[PDB]
Amino acid sequence: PQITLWKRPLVTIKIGGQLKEALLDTGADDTVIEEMSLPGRWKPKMIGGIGGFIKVRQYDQIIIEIAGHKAIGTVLVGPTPVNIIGRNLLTQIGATLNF
Amino acid sequence: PQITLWKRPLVTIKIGGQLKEALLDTGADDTVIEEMSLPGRWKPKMIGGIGGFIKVRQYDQIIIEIAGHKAIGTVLVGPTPVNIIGRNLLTQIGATLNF
Ligand SMILES: COc1ccc(S(=O)(=O)N(CC(C)C)C[C@@H](O)[C@H](Cc2ccccc2)NC(=O)O[C@H]2C[C@@H](C)O[C@H]2[C@@H]2CCCO2)cc1
Ligand SMILES: [Cl-]
Ligand SMILES: [Cl-]
Ligand SMILES: [Cl-]
Ligand SMILES: [Cl-]
Ligand code: NA
Numbered sequence A, B: 001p002q003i004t005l006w007k008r009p010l011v012t013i014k015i016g017g018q019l020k021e022a023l024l025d026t027g028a029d030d031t032v033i034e035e036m037s038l039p040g041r042w043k044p045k046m047i048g049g050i051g052g053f054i055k056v057r058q059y060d061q062i063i064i065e066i067a068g069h070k071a072i073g074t075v076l077v078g079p080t081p082v083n084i085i086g087r088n089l090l091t092q093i094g095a096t097l098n099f
């Protein structure tokens, strides 16, 4: 698809058996999901941006379905104000910025 | 251009005759630049990032070139870590997300 940017680029994702809405975010290095349980090992991480840093749990090798496209990678879980699909997973679905 | 996301989508911008680096950010509603001098009056704005809210200065109708494309629109100035081109200016340069 072609997604214009008049509004936030929100899509449906499936992660950990749950449907969520998430923002396709080219400015995010990382994928960050609101609090939820995921299987397997995790380790703590700090991520920062506007307003400072938050602590998250880092889960590696997590499968997400993003607008119908399956990907696998690291997913961070913590008190993000919105679910964010960052570049680590946008690359895997072949997303590009065009102008 | 078609910009892939394996690296950060950094471009050169020109604002007030100055070249700067900035991030093309589909997750940003607005454009936010590091402290600099802009002409005219400013209005107050609070923006919310990963870490919380910050105060910025909102300057309207500012001339800005983004990767060679002309834009004229709102620029927020404040303590952002990186210069961010958000959707208010990405729409002016015709940017879309594609996969
Ligand atoms: C209203 O206009 C706004 C409001 C907010 C922002 S923003 O906070 O920058 N933000 C909104 C988003 C968190 C929902 C845009 C993000 O793309 C934002 C842009 C940015 C900010 C500061 C330094 C570098 C890059 N990315 C961002 O915060 O990314 C961090 C969080 C996590 C997802 O990944 C992190 C890493 C390190 C920084 C880059 O990627 C921009 C404009
Ligand atoms: Cl919107
Ligand atoms: Cl990854
Ligand atoms: Cl590619
Ligand atoms: Cl905001
Ligand atoms: Na894992």
Ligand code: NA
Pocket (backbone or CB within 6 Å): B039, B040, B041, B059, B060, B061, B062
């Ligand atoms: Na102005």
